[PDB]
Amino acid sequence: TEAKHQQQFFQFRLSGQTIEVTSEYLFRHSDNELLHWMVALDGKPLASGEVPLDVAPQGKQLIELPELPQPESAGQLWLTVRVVQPNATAWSEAGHISAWQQWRLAENLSVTAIPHLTTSEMDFCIELGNKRWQFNRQSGFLSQMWIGDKKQLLTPLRDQFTRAPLDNDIGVSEATRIDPNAWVERWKAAGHYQAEAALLQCTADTLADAVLITTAHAWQHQGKTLFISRKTYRIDGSGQMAITVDVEVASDTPHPARIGLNCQLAQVAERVNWLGLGPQENYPDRLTAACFDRWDLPLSDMYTPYVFPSENGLRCGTRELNYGPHQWRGDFQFNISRYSQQQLMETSHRHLLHAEEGTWLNIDGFHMGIGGDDSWSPSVSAEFQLSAGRYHYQLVWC
């Protein structure tokens, strides 16, 4: 789909209220072409239209949109155009989408019963109605969350800096010969897959309306600190737990594959619903074909069955993610599946993968590009590499 979007025969420019459609066809007039346009706020359609495309080869057609909606509710207006072929051809059926494009229209910024903290030598417990939160004071992570008496976590929520290596990360390197310049080889040499978290700080403070949990960890490999993560957890009286993450990366360590969180949820749900770029798997350097919208796919659709297993299924630019009873909000990238990154790393064939007990969620503030110029040398461009020393992302869990 990325190849399709980059190779499409219609280019689009947005000037104020006017869409300019340029034809890249050299010989044919757009005689089986129809432009559909939609405006949505957060995946909620507000306006929709249709004009017959009448553009000469290598020509232009200016399209005046009607008086567009001016909503007062907060959110980002999105304009999406599509080229749909009404009729059938020898190689396509009726309704075939051949080109598309999305723009951001005017944004409206958002202008708008106490959790009880219990302290023990081993844990930090926060209770708010039927919701409970457990923070292990030895690991410094949220070990468990309760809704009623049902566990929500199989694995604690922990920082993740690695991914199951892609074929581009491996790049010709093998256990026998080894290419020291490959990304996976540099990560293994630096000890990113073997880095151990050391609890630097863990303190809980009860504010006037919320419980504040401040944690700090250092990931070190053989007397060398690679990453430091300082986190804040704020559980308010509305049941929302906002997580603020600040991560420092040593300049002399190789750039990490991701700065995010990973956990194994105890629940398997049939549908994955999210507001963001989709509906297909997309990555920071392969997301032009993805459109911002509200997407609803089964959990199986969120996993890409690559024959050689690796990190897959990531969705970038996601503002809201819903999986069963859990909602995650912010600006993040995520992948969700029944396989863990460790299992994908250790398995060489996709038919040898087994679904695990729950669902593995990988929510990331920042993700490295996947490359693709070649698969024998590193090919991720520098602007897609997590080369900044310090990173920050926020997240809401409710």
State the binding site for substrate: 376
Segment lying near its own copies (by CB under 8 A), choices 153-161, 191-199, 258-266, 389-397: 389-397
Token look-up 């080889």 returns 185
> Are 130 and 148 contacting, i.e. CB atoms less than 8 angstroms apart?
yes
246 in contact with its own copies (CB under 8 A): yes
Binder of its own copies out of 73, 251, 307, 349 (CB under 8 A): 251
Residue with smaller CB distance to its own copies, 110 or 176: 110
Residue with smaller CB distance to its own copies, 164 or 321: 321
Residue with smaller CB distance to its own copies, 240 or 304: 240
Token look-up 């023990």 returns 120
Shortest distance, position 70 Cβ to its own copies, whole Å? 11
- Segments of 250-389 assigned E as strands: 258-265, 271-278, 291-298, 315-323, 326-337, 359-367
Shortest distance, position 106 Cβ to its own copies, whole Å? 4
Segment lying near its own copies (by CB under 8 A), choices 141-149, 174-182, 200-208, 308-316: 200-208
Residue 165 in tokens: 């290596």
Binding pattern for the stretch 66-105 against its own copies, x by CB under 8 A and - elsewhere: ----------x---------------------------xx
Measure the CA–CA gap between 168 and 190, rounded to whole angstroms: 18
> Are 127 and 115 contacting, i.e. CB atoms less than 8 angstroms apart?
yes
Residue with smaller CB distance to its own copies, 189 or 207: 207
202 in contact with its own copies (CB under 8 A): no
108 in contact with its own copies (CB under 8 A): yes
Binder of its own copies out of 3, 109, 113, 307 (CB under 8 A): 109
Q: Which of positions 302-331 make contact with its own copies (CB under 8 A)?
A: 331
Binding pattern for the stretch 225-244 against its own copies, x by CB under 8 A and - elsewhere: x--x----------------
Measure the CA–CA gap between 81 and 103, rounded to whole angstroms: 9
Binding site, annotated residues: 376
Residue 269 in tokens: 């749900």
Binder of its own copies out of 252, 270, 349, 354 (CB under 8 A): 252
Burial label for 95, CB within 10 Å (0-12, 13-18, 19+), is: exposed
Shortest distance, position 249 Cβ to its own copies, whole Å? 9
Give 31's contacts (C-beta < 8 A, 6+ positions apart): none
205 in contact with its own copies (CB under 8 A): yes
Measure the CA–CA gap between 371 and 169, rounded to whole angstroms: 8
Measure the CA–CA gap between 170 and 185, rounded to whole angstroms: 7
Residue with smaller CB distance to its own copies, 110 or 222: 110
CA dihedral 19, 24, 25, 30 (to 10 degrees): 0
Would you put residue 224 in left (φ > 0), alpha (ψ -120 to 50) or beta?
beta
Total residues interacting with its own copies, rule: CB under 8 A: 27
357 in contact with its own copies (CB under 8 A): no
111 in contact with its own copies (CB under 8 A): yes
Binder of its own copies out of 94, 97, 189, 207 (CB under 8 A): 207
Measure the CA–CA gap between 393 and 365, rounded to whole angstroms: 5
> Are 163 and 257 contacting, i.e. CB atoms less than 8 angstroms apart?
yes
Query: Pairing state of beta strands 390-397 and 241-249?
Result: antiparallel
Shortest distance, position 18 Cβ to its own copies, whole Å? 16
* Nearest one of 280, 283, 306, 278 to 294, comparing CA atoms: 278
Give 16's contacts (C-beta < 8 A, 6+ positions apart): none
394 in contact with its own copies (CB under 8 A): yes
114 in contact with its own copies (CB under 8 A): no
250 in contact with its own copies (CB under 8 A): yes
Q: Which residues bind its own copies (CB under 8 A)?
A: 76, 104-111, 203, 205, 207-208, 212, 218, 225, 228, 246, 248, 250-252, 331, 383, 390, 392, 394
